[PDB]
Design a protein around this nucleic acid. Structure first.
Ligand SMILES: Nc1ncnc2c1ncn2[C@@H]1O[C@H](COS(=O)(=O)NC(=O)[C@@H](N)CCC(=O)O)[C@@H](O)[C@H]1O
Ligand SMILES: [Zn+2]
Lengths: 482, 472, 564
RNA sequence: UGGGAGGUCGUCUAACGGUAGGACGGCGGACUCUGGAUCCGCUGGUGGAGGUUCGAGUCCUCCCCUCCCAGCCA
């Protein structure tokens, strides 16, 4: 509350494509033996040229859109020159000037208050391969091993303004980001398998600000619960600052996932000179207006408006909708279902309770379980017709979500037709007290569902059936002359 | 007929029995001729030819900076010899896929970088007629084992006129299609923007015939997108009614006397077929080479960044990595290359980018734009391919020299611009020919103006300028 | 426009050495070369879109499929050097019957301390399950932490247990075909089977700093010969692979974990001993164990163990993570607490068969009588009756079932059980008539729950020097009517023919009538003078198996204790 | 923080979706003798907010408490 932190992070992203990045090798190469996904091109052999993968672009635009990014009609490819055993070409294909999509913003549920966060650039990169030293991590020995399998897998590197305030807004910024992409179909976003990486920036001075305080940067730190407790730490020590005579200065730190700390530098692959020129091996990428309004209709409805729809556009309450729109598969099976029985009102409840239940008391998603809308359509028109109490129509509902059997079918078998006929409910309910007077006596004084006992009697004695409405009407009156 | 000389088209048809000896008696004549001229770095073992394809039997040779599965590609540079190909450059794929049988990998400058051939770190390559002189260009060894007659035709990269130069200076026909017509995939590229694999042949009918085989878009080079281009059909059709164009500082240096002389013939020996050899003055073209020597060795200091002892080729067994890279890239590249990869990294450095580089990258749209619409009042431009006879085995140790010995070649690159070099001389007793620039991406037309000269010119008997008789 | 430093920032950027020879050699014609370009300065320094490529600016980008290169092999037989597939580079018509695995459980305590009522249920569980399914009970001391352990704690962990009546068919005290049954007795095996996995792509070695066994140095899958004699430490860790690990669990249903949550973990200490998780599996496998029934504290551990099993390629056992018994502070018992230890409840008076009663009852489906032997209980036993919650230990309930128990058995029994209790506690009882004590027992028992109670209450029937309660005096002797009564009392008794039970109740059923004090205050002086304690068995039994002899005495030697 | 497992009187344990009971503790009594024995009566609970239902401890969503694994502890 007293001191104000400004955080901004860099993010890399592995896109879940097929064809790699500038060639025709598979780029989903995790459990793959070393150098089995090599090709003359992505391996930097002499006389090899890069061929822009379409899919790599499709994916970028999707995420650019979701991120509310002013895209870019025109887009150039560039060469980021530098040497390292994990990087073949002697350079890397990125997009310094002309990122396919500039400037945007992602809104966070915000473990704080509901906030917006400004995107800066949003370009594409190639990504080098695994370099492992002779048995060790942040260190050294005698020889390192290169595994190029990963060389040339479509990367997207999103950079974001120093908006973020809380080391939580950070966690949830990337919690949002994964939970977006694990969705539109453009990445697994799962930091663990190095699919979502990130570095970060921090600062502080007064209480009300005039600028910032220049960064610090925290490369290295997988895990989300580890980007928090580590930007957490890079704050507990930034306060013992101008609160002990000290400025907020430069240097860069990574974080030991063992202890719980952070360090300065030792490796020394510094902020050299990367010489960014345009990639003559590739002619510029110009995105068809006449095509692109065709991949804004490709990308799926995000679960926030999929609600806004159902909401004031299907009659469903904020609550009812909000629930239905999680399991996107379920959200589909709602409509798949409404289509065939244009009463959403009831469809909701049923899938929210009875249905969503067996999708749990046995693990599954609607997706494959013998339950077509033709079951509700049937169930329904049948309660509609009064051959079935909303009770019985809940009693039967498992044997149906089990046997596939059509509702109206399993009723023609156990004979569950709502006997609200003759008031022999009048009859059974009398004998009900003859042989149970402690109870009637109880309702003679304790009103609260005391007849609830008799309700149950009539049911037990007629198989589910009776008729809630009618059976109750009767009882609450035969408890008036005792 | 002596095979030492034999257009592809004479090869066209000579009996199923008679013509199957053409491969063998091509390596056979190599064992003899070669040791003197020294133009081949590989030369096949003894593999043989079958059938399939209009143009079989016909033995070819191709510049050793051009990946050729089956036989070490080496760019004639210590760092990259000893490297077995891993894929047929598409030009070679398309060649073999047609009938052609490649024989050996022809020498060249180190990484196609220079303007003579001696700069090759494997060994110098001597000009067929006059082992004292030099083939010139970058793909010298190519355009010299063709002249000498060890092979029917060759392929060669052209970055600063690297097929034209050595063709005019060595005696034969070198063509440079427009940047966008021949796959650069499989060409160990030195500059990505300018490079282009072209033929090198005896008839200007083959320079035109090779194209219609070694071309088409390729999905392995995203910079070759298609175009409706014909190198034949209008071939034999003298420019009997076309306006032309000529440079200006073309006469403002000091062309070797014997040169512009047997050149000024091209003027009238064309006007004799009836065509305006008028002139126009282009300004900023004045720079070109100064502009091409920013861009090119800039692209080199990254196109070559890849040869690092890391994964293939040469490697100096040094205990540290910071060592290994350097001591390998030093003892490997060496010579000319070295200094190019240097000035280039410097063109792209911290406080020089928009200064030197980007500027040059814009001047190349200056010269590009000017040269261009000049191809939009009338047809072909033109110039002597060479500004010199064909210098002697030893050379003024001065890079600047070579780096100028072009001009006539450079600007065709700074637009792709098609450009042939057809012979029409013998001057100072070293057969230098002329060049015929073309409209950006407008080819066929230059393959008309070519044959035009090649016949309607003194010296050339049978229709094809003579070939150097070789000590054997 | 001409320098010597450019050598750094330049020949360093294209990583190009330049032996002292060709040094100032470059500069020469690099200077000229640089100079010539200056013939550029004559240009347009504003608005002029650059050209890096001719062409017609599109891209036309591949929509194709993923394809493994048609000749990957040449790319790789073209490397300078290689290790395990990587590029290596400079550091910087007769049949037979079918046998079904036979039933076998383990109670695998670690001698880290005293056995509590915790390990007692979770052991009786295994015990019963074996005794019901007709199988075998195995008992294994797991002492891999050589500080946290002991041969006393091990020694006392078997006693408490032998007391609860839990015979094991195989243990460290009488062997079994699967010896040995301590783990420190089998480092023979772990390092064996551990290297059986560093053979495989599955475990690896880790070396540390000589003078700080914290920080990690290297790794390769090969034994650090050199380093282990140069005096460093080495652990073996298990290479967790990516994937998902799961299992059924008779109590906790289907369970699944994935291993992107389980980081590479130590399975062989610096000191030749296993880590817990590895140690089991091996032993748990070797010891042919069909069912593991253990502490819920171990669920989150059945993955790590299940990885191991499926890397040795071994069939694992059924699992069954039972809940803990907690403390009064919502939390599991342990070595820590130490105040809820079987030993305690033993000498504190609780009868074995009653602990086993409550332990077989704390959080079990009640079903029927609440009081029972662990034999009776057997014939109605499903390891599924157990509830899922961590119950809290409730001495109140224990002592209750304890009491109901002694009062319900044969008299001889409690006798033996009392006496043998006497020793272990160490109260020192001065036995007497082999059938008088066997009568003041009969009486004393009916009024007390434990046995430290059946001792205190039995107390003044033997020892004749019994105290008097710093409280009985307070409202009965310091009373004004006292001597008057204890006195009339003495004669009312001193004059008593038949001393049986009938005309013994009567004796007092009138000392009351004559109004010395209230029926109450009288009856309780008589009592509280002949026993010393306010509450005792029924006064008509006490003064009857004391004798006119003793009652007169005790009646007397307080009439003197009244003094002043 | 993640992953896991639990959540009905003070403590354990019950209630086809139909009056939330039983046991132990506790409080009050009774037993023409105490009570630490025995009997008897009472007290006292579904963690929270909503949804489905005639009816919810039981079915659905979210939230809250507790415990476990995250060990060169086991
Ligand atoms: N509070 C508690 N209440 C009720 N049971 C408890 C308990 N605490 C531990 N236990 C269970 O008692 C058994 C032995 O505990 S222990 O001595 O710590 N030993 C061990 O945990 C391990 N040596 C054995 C684990 C295994 O079964 O594979 C183990 O099964 C353990 O889970
Ligand atoms: Zn590839």
């Amino acid at each position: 509350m007293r001191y104000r932190p400004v955080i901004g992070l860099e993010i890399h992203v592995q896109l879940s494509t097929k064809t790699k990045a500038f060639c025709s090798c598979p780029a989903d190469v995790f459990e793959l033996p070393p150098n089995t996904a090599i090709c003359p091109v992505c391996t930097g052999q002499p006389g090899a040229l890069p061929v822009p993968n379409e899919e790599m672009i499709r994916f970028a635009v999707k995420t650019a859109l979701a991120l509310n990014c002013k895209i870019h009609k025109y887009s150039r490819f560039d060469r980021k020159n530098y040497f390292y055993p994990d990087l073949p070409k002697g350079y890397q294909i990125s997009q310094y000037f002309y990122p396919i999509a500039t400037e945007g913003f992602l809104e966070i549920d915000g473990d704080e208050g509901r906030k917006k966060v400004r995107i800066r650039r949003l370009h594409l990169e190639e990504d080098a391969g695994k370099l492992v030293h002779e048995g060790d991590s942040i260190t050294r020995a005698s020889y390192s091993l290169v595994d190029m399998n990963r060389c040339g897998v479509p990367l997207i590197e999103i950079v974001t303004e120093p908006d973020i305030s809380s080391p939580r807004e950070a966690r949830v910024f990337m919690e949002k980001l994964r939970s977006i992409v694990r969705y539109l179909g453009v990445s697994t976003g799962d930091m663990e398998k190095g699919a979502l990486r990130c570095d970060a920036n921090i600062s502080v001075v007064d209480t009300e600000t005039g600028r910032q305080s220049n960064r610090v940067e925290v490369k290295n730190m997988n895990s989300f619960r580890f980007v928090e407790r580590a930007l957490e730490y890079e704050f507990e020590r930034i306060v013992k600052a101008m609160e002990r005579g000290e400025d907020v200065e430069r240097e860069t730190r990574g974080w030991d996932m063992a202890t719980k700390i952070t360090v300065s530098m030792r490796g020394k692959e510094e902020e050299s000179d990367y010489r960014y020129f345009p990639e003559p091996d590739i002619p510029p990428v110009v995105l068809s207006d006449e095509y692109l309004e065709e991949v804004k209709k490709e990308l799926p409805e995000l679960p926030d408006e999929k609600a806004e729809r159902f909401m004031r556009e299907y009659g469903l309450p904020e609550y009812d909708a909000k629930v239905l729109t999680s399991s996107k598969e379920l959200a589909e099976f709602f409509e798949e279902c409404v289509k065939v029985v244009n009463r959403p009102k009831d469809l909701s409840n049923w899938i929210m309770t009875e249905v969503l239940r067996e999708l749990n008391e046995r693990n599954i998603e609607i997706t494959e379980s013998k339950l077509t809308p033709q079951h509700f359509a049937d169930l329904f028109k049948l309660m509609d017709e009064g051959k079935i109490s909303i009770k019985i129509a809940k009693e039967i509902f498992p044997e149906v979500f089990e046997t596939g059997k059509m509702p109206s079918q399993i009723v023609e078998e156990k004979g569950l037709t709502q006997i609200n006929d003759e008031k022999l409910i009048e009859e059974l309910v009398k004998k009900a007290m003859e042989q149970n007077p402690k109870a009637v006596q109880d309702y003679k004084s304790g009103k609260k569902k005391a007849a609830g006992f008799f309700v149950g009697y009539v049911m037990r004695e007629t198989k589910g059936k009776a008729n809630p409405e009618l059976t109750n009407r009767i009882i609450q009156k035969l408890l008036e002359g005792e | 007929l002596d095979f030492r000389k034999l257009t592809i088209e004479e090869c066209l048809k000579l009996s199923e029995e008679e013509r199957e000896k053409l491969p063998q008696l091509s390596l056979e004549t190599i064992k003899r001729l070669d040791p003197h001229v020294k133009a081949f770095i590989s030369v096949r073992e003894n593999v043989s030819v079958e059938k399939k394809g209009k143009f079989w039997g016909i033995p070819v040779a191709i510049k050793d900076n051009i990946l050729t599965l089956g036989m070490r590609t080496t760019c004639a540079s210590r760092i990259l010899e000893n490297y077995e190909s891993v894929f047929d450059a598409t030009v070679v794929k398309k060649m073999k896929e047609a009938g052609f049988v490649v024989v050996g990998k022809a020498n060249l400058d180190e990484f196609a970088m220079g303007s003579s051939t001696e700069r090759s770190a494997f060994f110098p390559t001597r000009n067929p007629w006059d082992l004292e002189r030099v083939p010139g260009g970058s793909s010298g060894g190519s355009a010299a084992a063709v002249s000498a007659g060890m092979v029917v035709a060759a392929l060669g990269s052209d970055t600063g006129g690297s097929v034209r130069q050595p063709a005019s200076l060595c005696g034969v026909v070198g063509y440079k299609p427009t940047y966008g017509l021949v796959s650069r995939y499989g060409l160990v590229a030195f500059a990505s923007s300018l490079d282009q694999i072209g033929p090198i042949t005896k008839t200007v009918r083959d320079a035109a015939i090779l194209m219609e085989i070694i071309s088409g878009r390729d999905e392995n080079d995203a910079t070759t997108v298609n175009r409706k281009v014909d190198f034949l059909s209008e071939i034999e059709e003298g420019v009997s009614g076309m306006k032309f164009a000529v440079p200006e500082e073309i006469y403002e240096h000091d062309i070797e006397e014997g040169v512009s002389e047997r050149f000024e013939e091209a003027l009238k020996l064309l006007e004799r077929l009836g065509a305006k050899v008028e002139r126009v003055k282009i300004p900023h073209i004045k720079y070109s080479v100064a502009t091409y020597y920013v861009i090119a060795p800039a692209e080199a200091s990254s196109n070559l960044a890849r040869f690092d002892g890391v994964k293939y080729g040469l490697r100096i067994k040094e205990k540290g990595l910071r060592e290994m890279y350097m001591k390998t890239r030093n003892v490997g590249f060496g010579e000319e290359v070295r200094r190019r990869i240097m000035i280039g990294t410097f063109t792209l450095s911290a406080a020089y980018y928009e200064a030197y580089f980007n500027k040059a990258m814009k001047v190349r749209r200056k010269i590009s734009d000017e040269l261009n619409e000049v191809l939009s009042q009338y047809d072909a431009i033109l110039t002597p391919t060479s500004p010199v006879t064909a210098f002697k085995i030893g050379e003024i140790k001065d890079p600047l020299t070579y780096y100028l010995m072009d001009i006539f070649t450079i600007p065709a690159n700074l637009a792709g611009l098609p450009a042939i070099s057809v012979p029409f001389g013998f001057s100072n007793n070293l057969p230098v020919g002329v060049q015929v620039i073309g409209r950006r991406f407008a080819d066929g037309k230059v393959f008309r103006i070519a044959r035009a000269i090649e016949k309607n010119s003194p010296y050339n008997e049978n229709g094809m300028f003579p070939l150097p008789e070789v000590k054997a | 426009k001409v320098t010597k430093d450019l050598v750094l920032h330049l020949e360093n950027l294209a990583r190009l050495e330049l032996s002292e020879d060709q040094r100032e050699s470059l500069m020469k014609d690099f200077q000229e070369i640089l100079d010539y370009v200056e013939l550029l300065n004559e240009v347009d320094v504003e608005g002029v879109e650059p050209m890096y490529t001719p062409v017609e600016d599109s891209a036309k980008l591949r929509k194709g499929d993923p394809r493994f290169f048609e000749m990957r092999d040449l790319i790789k037989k073209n490397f300078p050097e290689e290790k395990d597939g990587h590029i290596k580079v400079p550091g910087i018509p007769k049949k037979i019957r079918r046998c079904f695995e036979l039933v076998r459980v383990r109670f695998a305590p670690s001698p880290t301390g005293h056995l509590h009522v915790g390990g007692a249920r979770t052991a009786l569980f295994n015990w019963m399950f074996a005794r019901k399914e007709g199988g075998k009970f195995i008992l294994r001391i797991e002492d891999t932490d050589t500080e946290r352990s002991s041969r006393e704690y091990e020694q006392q962990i078997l006693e408490s247990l032998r007391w609860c009546g839990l015979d094991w068919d195989e243990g460290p005290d009488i062997g079994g075909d699967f010896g040995p049954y301590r783990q420190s007795e089998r480092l023979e095996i772990y390092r064996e089977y551990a290297e059986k996995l560093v053979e495989d792509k599955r475990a690896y070695y880790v070396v540390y700093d000589k003078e700080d066994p914290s920080k990690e140095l290297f790794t390769t899958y090969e034994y650090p010969h050199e380093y282990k004699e140069k005096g460093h430490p080495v652990t073996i860790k298990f290479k967790v692979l990516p994937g998902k690990t799961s299992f059924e669990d008779l109590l906790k249903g289907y369970m699944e974990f994935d291993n992107s949550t389980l980081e590479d973990f130590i399975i062989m200490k610096s000191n030749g001993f296993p880590t817990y998780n590895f140690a089991v599996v091996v032993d748990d496998h070797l010891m042919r164990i069909s069912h593991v029934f253990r502490g819920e504290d171990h669920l989150s551990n059945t993955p790590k163990q299940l990885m191991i099993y499926e890397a040795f390629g071994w069939e694992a056992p059924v699992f069954m993570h039972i809940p803990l018994i907690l403390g009064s502070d919502r939390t599991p018992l342990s070595k820590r607490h130490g105040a809820t230890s079987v030993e305690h409840f033993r000498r504190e008076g609780i009868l074995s068969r009653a602990l086993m009663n409550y332990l077989a009852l704390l959080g079990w489906r009640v079903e029927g009588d609440e009081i029972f032997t662990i034999e009776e209980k057997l014939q109605s036993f499903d390891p599924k009756d157990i509830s899922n919650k961590g119950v809290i230990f409730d001495y109140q309930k224990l002592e209750w079932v304890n009491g109901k128990h002694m009062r319900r058995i044969d008299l001889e029994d409690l006798k033996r059980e009392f006496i043998e209790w006497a020793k272990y506690a160490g109260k020192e009882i001065p036995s007497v008539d082999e059938r008088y004590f066997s009568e003041t027992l009969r009486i004393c028992r009916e009024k007390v729950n434990t046995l430290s109670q059946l001792y205190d209450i039995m107390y003044p029937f033997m020892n004749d020097d019994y105290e008097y309660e710093k409280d009985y005096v307070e409202k009965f002797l310091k009373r004004e009517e006292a001597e008057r009564v204890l006195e009339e009392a003495k004669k009312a008794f001193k004059d008593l023919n038949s001393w049986n039970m009938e005309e013994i109740e009567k004796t007092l059923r009138d000392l009351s009538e004559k109004g010395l004090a209230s029926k109450k205050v009288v009856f309780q002086l008589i009592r509280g003078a002949v026993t010393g304690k306010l509450v005792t068995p029924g006064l008509f039994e006490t003064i009857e198996v004391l004798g006119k002899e003793r009652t007169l005495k005790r009646l007397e030697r307080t009439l003197q204790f009244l003094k002043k």
